[PDB]
Amino acid sequence: MRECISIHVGQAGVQIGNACWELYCLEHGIQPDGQMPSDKTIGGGDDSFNTFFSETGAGKHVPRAVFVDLEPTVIDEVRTGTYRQLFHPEQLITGKEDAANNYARGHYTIGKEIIDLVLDRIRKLADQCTGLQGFLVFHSFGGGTGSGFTSLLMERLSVDYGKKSKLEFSIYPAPQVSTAVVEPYNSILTTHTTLEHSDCAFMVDNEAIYDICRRNLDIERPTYTNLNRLISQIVSSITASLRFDGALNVDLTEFQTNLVPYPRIHFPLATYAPVISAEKAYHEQLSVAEITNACFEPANQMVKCDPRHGKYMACCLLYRGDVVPKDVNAAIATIKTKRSIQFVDWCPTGFKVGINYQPPTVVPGGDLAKVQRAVCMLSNTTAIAEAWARLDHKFDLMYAKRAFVHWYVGEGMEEGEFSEAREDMAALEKDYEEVGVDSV
Amino acid sequence: IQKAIEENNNFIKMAKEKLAQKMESNKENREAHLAAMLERLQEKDKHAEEVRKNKEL
Amino acid sequence: REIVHIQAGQCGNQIGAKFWEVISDEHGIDPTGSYHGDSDLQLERINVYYNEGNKYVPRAILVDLEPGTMDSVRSGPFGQIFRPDNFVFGQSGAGNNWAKGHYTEGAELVDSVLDVVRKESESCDCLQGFQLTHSLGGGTGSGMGTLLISKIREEYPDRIMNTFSVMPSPKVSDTVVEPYNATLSVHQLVENTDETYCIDNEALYDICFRTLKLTPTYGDLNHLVSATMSGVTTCLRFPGADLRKLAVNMVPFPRLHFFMPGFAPLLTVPELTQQMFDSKNMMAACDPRHGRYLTVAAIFRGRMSMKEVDEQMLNVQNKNSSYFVEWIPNNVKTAVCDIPPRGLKMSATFIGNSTAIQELFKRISEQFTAMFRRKAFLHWYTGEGMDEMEFTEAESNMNDLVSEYQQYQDATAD
Ligand SMILES: Nc1nc2c(ncn2[C@@H]2O[C@H](COP(=O)(O)OP(=O)(O)OP(=O)(O)O)[C@@H](O)[C@H]2O)c(=O)[nH]1
Ligand SMILES: CCC[C@@H](NC(=O)[C@]1(C)CSC(/C(C)=N/O)=N1)c1cc(OCC2CC2)cc(=O)o1
Ligand SMILES: Nc1nc2c(ncn2[C@@H]2O[C@H](COP(=O)(O)OP(=O)(O)O)[C@@H](O)[C@H]2O)c(=O)[nH]1
Ligand SMILES: [Ca+2]
Ligand SMILES: [Mg+2]
Ligand SMILES: [Mg+2]
């Protein structure tokens, strides 16, 4: 009951899906062959971890996941990887030719050749669910598959599954490790098309995850493996309430009620702490107050922006590990007197708290230190619109000269789709301004 | 409750329709662009056959 | 992800031959086709250029209207590794006449060439596209080369087409009608190729004479071209982006797809980067500081601090911001390959879509109008069935190409 189906699209979505499912297996004591000795109910069960894992008669715990990419090289590594026995071959779908960082190719030319197959495979997983709750879609904004095919899939899922919840984990482009100059085009196009089909989207700025690995883990030039193992911790903290039980456990859907005041204002800012190397965690245990204070340090945000220059509409704290309410309430009291937490005048100023008692896990051989407690803050702040403004400005620079637009027109798109998408982003930027103004 | 049913079915309906128009306009535009390309390459062949015919004259 | 290679004309076949010698060595391939390398990285991307009795045969096609140049390929080094059926040659020759290559002596043979293309392409799991080596100053490489591109685009309209085009220079002039063959072939490349890398002989000659201090043979000029072509294809041939993804990010406007190559050294990362961006290391006779970069792609080879490469490429951009258009953010892409070239501990190759390339088209247009103003040597063309309008059309199209490069050189963000 209350099953969740994860969909991983394009390189970024797939490689992040690898990190997440490896981490889930470690958190639940699931072996690379899918065996879970601690699970005494063979063939099924309604345990909390069954929201993400189905069970076979042979005792294999199979992720409720689908990996999709328009070229095979990234998903081949999953087929021959450490967790090859974890996934049924039909959950790994591949084409032959990628989208070439072209939204049009991912949404139309190439994507329309595999979309029916992808939906058929998603349908098979949903038929195994006694009470499907919703989908989790992992993708990049910049890739042609991450942007184009994801938009097509989200549109098709709305048709085949009504208003069943769909959550996004979206990789916001960082020029540094980016290989696409047309990344702004693909970002605006996919955001516009998915906006009405997504209920909640967690953006992850690669540049923010990049700086956290350079500053906090002392990695000179982080790799995707470095970024994805940190991103998986955030995803784990967000999904932990669905995979684990607990008295003080607060379901993600309950946070979502507070995080989304209007359908289009569904982009929460995520902040995570602690991110510490082993060398620094040695003989230094970070308390509840320390990791909580770190949530309000902008250097720990998943998206580059300044909440201190914006207004809050919601503040959620997702703790996991050795944490009790007494300490949390004490730490929040301190922060309420030392920080500039300005709320809009039409929303209460309370902080919503959840505590999962299962401690955090780390991938063996990784750079992240194993800590006893951690926290993820989900806040709805107007400051996240800064990420839209930076991306919309780059869009405008290139589109004024119609740079690269012929690649999109050649695949069948029209200039009207560009202007239409850019106007939608303009309205979204205006929407975030309107919610911040005081009432009359 | 029937109003909630109606709005969900209308959201499904509009999505299916708007997507159908998108995938048709794109199919028509791409086929036209690719038809013009092959048509220009046909005029090069027509011009080439007229070059070889102007030589033997 | 296979690529189909094509060599056409005297220049095209000698440049292509050198190219296969260089990459064959890098992948541990001997002149007979066997693999005797020490690294598995040499074979991970081997299928991009080679087909598999536990042998590796270049996916190449040699074309020429005379057997002279191609016969020297079979006897030369690595001459037997090629597939004998992929040799397609005539006899009458082209006589350094574009009309003969594009209409007469070339159109008769073009069909048999396409047959070899179809056979090679049907053996591809997923064909990326094609690359052509040829010159624009001759007759076969220019005339028949442009023809073959138009004919391949008919059967493979959705495949990427690249060309390594050698531009004519009076400093190495083999003929006087070269300004005609170049302006006529440029008229074609503007319409039927996705990326064209302008290998200017004037630049190769000035690099051999001034820098290398060779008071220069075609073998010296080609030693530069083989190093340039090896660096360009590095990202394709070693693990660590397909032809379409590359073209999508390097070509902001369809007609402006002519690039300036660069190589260094002709040693630290700062020194290597500064030399690579110097006008003296450009394989095209154009000064980039007389225009602006629309896009740039650079590849570093060798064991070198990647963190240092990132900082040095951000440094050059910041200190030379005026030579990069502001309306294309993040238009410089860089890669690093752990495997160095041969004989170098670390090198760097770069390709730029710069508005300064108009200087190259201004030089070819001046040599063209100087002859077309008096109708010199026009009988070699009208005698094959051409008219004067076709010459003026090619002139007007290449003049418009210069105007467009200037339009975007002057464009501003505000
Ligand atoms: N965090 C993170 N970002 C990634 C990863 N892989 C790619 N990206 C980002 O994704 C963007 C490029 O899109 P990709 O996902 O690589 O491309 P794609 O979705 O497979 O689509 P196409 O390759 O064009 O068909 C860039 O901004 C990259 O920085 C990854 O493993 N982790
Ligand atoms: C000096 C580097 C040149 C190389 N480019 C690269 O190695 C990197 C760094 C990898 S990523 C990338 C881009 C465009 N990202 O967005 N540039 C390259 C190769 C290429 O093959 C052409 C075929 C005929 C032989 C096409 C191209 O256009 O750039
Ligand atoms: N770099 C270089 N350029 C060449 C070579 N051979 C010919 N060229 C140039 O190509 C032009 C002549 O074209 P060519 O290919 O020889 O005529 P074709 O036999 O009809 O294809 C002249 O401008 C030469 O400078 C060569 O080996 N190397
Ligand atoms: Ca069970
Ligand atoms: Mg991809
Ligand atoms: Mg010659």
Author numbering:
A (entry chain C): 1 to 440
B (entry chain E): 83 to 139
C (entry chain D): 2 to 42, 45 to 55, 58 to 220, 222 to 246, 250 to 275, 286 to 360, 369 to 441
Sentences from the paper on this structure:
PM534 is a novel synthetic compound derived from the Structure–Activity-Relationship study on the natural molecule PM742, isolated from the sponge of the order Lithistida, family Theonellidae, genus Discodermia (du Bocage 1869). In initial polymerization experiments, we found that the compound inhibits tubulin assembly in a dose-dependent manner so, we sought detailed structural information on the interaction of PM534 with tubulin using the T2R-TTL macromolecular complex, which includes two αβ-tubulin heterodimers in complex with one molecule of the stathmin-like domain of RB3 and one molecule of the tubulin tyrosine ligase. Additional derived compounds have been shown to retain the interaction with these centers while making further contacts with α-tubulin T5 loop (αS178) and top of helix H7 (αR221).22 Our structure highlights that PM534 also interacts with the 3 zones of the CBD, making contacts with β-tubulin N-terminal domain (β-strands S5 and S6), helix H7, the intermediate domain (helixes H8 and β-strands S8 and S10,) and α-tubulin T5 loop. The pyran ring establishes further interactions with βV238 (H7) and, the propyl chain with βI318 (S8) and βT376 (S10).
Strikingly, microtubules are a major component of the cellular cytoskeleton and a highly attractive target for anticancer drug development due to their implication in cell division (chromosome segregation) and tumor vascularization, among other functions. These filaments grow from αβ-tubulin heterodimers, which are modulated by a wide range of small molecules known as microtubule-targeting agents (MTAs).
